[PDB]
Amino acid sequence: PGLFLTLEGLDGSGKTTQARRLAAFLEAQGRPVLLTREPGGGLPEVRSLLLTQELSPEAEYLLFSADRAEHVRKVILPGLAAGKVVISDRYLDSSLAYQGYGRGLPLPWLREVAREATRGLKPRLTFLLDLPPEAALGLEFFRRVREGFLALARAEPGRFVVLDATLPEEEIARAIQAHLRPLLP
Amino acid sequence: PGLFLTLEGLDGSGKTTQARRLAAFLEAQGRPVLLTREPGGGLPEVRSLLLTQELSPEAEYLLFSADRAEHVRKVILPGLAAGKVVISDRYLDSSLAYQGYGRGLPLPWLREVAREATRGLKPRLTFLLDLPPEAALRLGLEFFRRVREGFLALARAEPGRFVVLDATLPEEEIARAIQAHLRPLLP
Ligand SMILES: [Mg+2]
Ligand SMILES: [Mg+2]
Ligand SMILES: [Mg+2]
Ligand SMILES: [Mg+2]
Ligand SMILES: [Mg+2]
Ligand SMILES: [Mg+2]
Ligand SMILES: [Mg+2]
């Protein structure tokens, strides 16, 4: 059956660190794990394309989406099918927060693109590492992005678990572990 | 006072040739013209990436869409705003033909994706260079037949936008026919 988990937040929020520690904890539990990330998990070359100077928000989202489509199809769905716990460091919510809340793109369009792109795959849980924006385009943009993530979590409070990114790393990892314990047996 | 025109059809249907001839004709009429193409008119690296890579149809489409988004914003709309006749060898109809009719992607989704990607920009006229895949001068034949039939299906639903030409005809006969259809829109 597998289990799909994501870690989200601004760059420098510790989401990469936590993804990694989660992968290792679950592994010690004897659970097969597949650790992945966006962007690049589908099309590693998308990382080049994404840095294009003055890229329109629409084009940026579409590149993220192309990578995501490939990632879901070639990496994530097959990992779940094999019974793995698949953990992604960034997924759809990142796009929604950066390209939607940050760059202003309409959420409904983002979600319609995403519906075929992802084959409707949602994570069972998403751990949001909430980081003050000054610790991450400029400050106004990162404020919109930070708040955007918080908006998405309010909106799907069953799937999101919001954690304070300024806590010590080992306390964050323990909180992730406690939200996860019920879903393992 | 811009005018957006596209050329569509299979690879080898004479698009480049006719684009070039139509640009010349407009130049002769004293009309500023800009000649462009997809893929790669937005993000050149999507074109080269996709020459050598084996993706899901959805990923392929979305990469073409990203290129198209940049193309429309950075090249097409700016040329139109300057009053140029902008001619693209390939546009959204190519993705619908190849990825929708060819690879089987849902057509409404493709259109909804394209709606923001293009800012709603549609060609005023699109010249479809129709020919059987076996006749093209530049999956197997079945895929290409689906694609060819896709273009013809798009055309028959949109007779106010498409002009269909038999692409097996001599190059100059095709050009004359394109010019006749175009004249009413000029100047
Ligand atoms: Mg997406
Ligand atoms: Mg996520
Ligand atoms: Mg929607
Ligand atoms: Mg067209
Ligand atoms: Mg498109
Ligand atoms: Mg047909
Ligand atoms: Mg159709």
Swiss-Prot record, chain B:
Keywords, ordered alphabetically: ATP-binding, Kinase, Nucleotide biosynthesis, Nucleotide-binding, Transferase
**Gene3D superfamilies noted in UniProt:** P-loop containing nucleotide triphosphate hydrolases
Signal sequence, renumbered to the chain: none
Q: Which domain of life is it from?
A: Bacteria
- State the EC number(s): 2.7.4.9
Q: Where does ATP bind?
A: 9-16
Q: Name one GO molecular function term.
A: ATP binding
Which transformation does this protein catalyse, written as a reaction? dTMP + ATP = dTDP + ADP
Q: List the SUPFAM superfamilies.
A: P-loop containing nucleoside triphosphate hydrolases
Q: Which GO terms describe its cellular component?
A: cytosol
Q: Which InterPro entries match?
A: P-loop_NTPase (IPR027417), Thymidylate_kin-like_dom (IPR039430), Thymidylate_kin_CS (IPR018095), Thymidylate_kinase (IPR018094)
User: Which GO terms of type biological process are on file?
Assistant: dTDP biosynthetic process; dTTP biosynthetic process; dUDP biosynthetic process
Q: Transmembrane region positions? A: none
HAMAP family tied to this protein: Thymidylate_kinase
Looking up NCBIfam families in the UniProt record yields: DTMP_kinase
PANTHER family assigned: THYMIDYLATE KINASE, UMP-CMP KINASE 2, MITOCHONDRIAL
Q: Which family does it belong to?
A: Belongs to the thymidylate kinase family.
UniProt function note? Phosphorylation of dTMP to form dTDP in both de novo and salvage pathways of dTTP synthesis.
What is this protein's name?
Thymidylate kinase
Which gene produces this protein? tmk
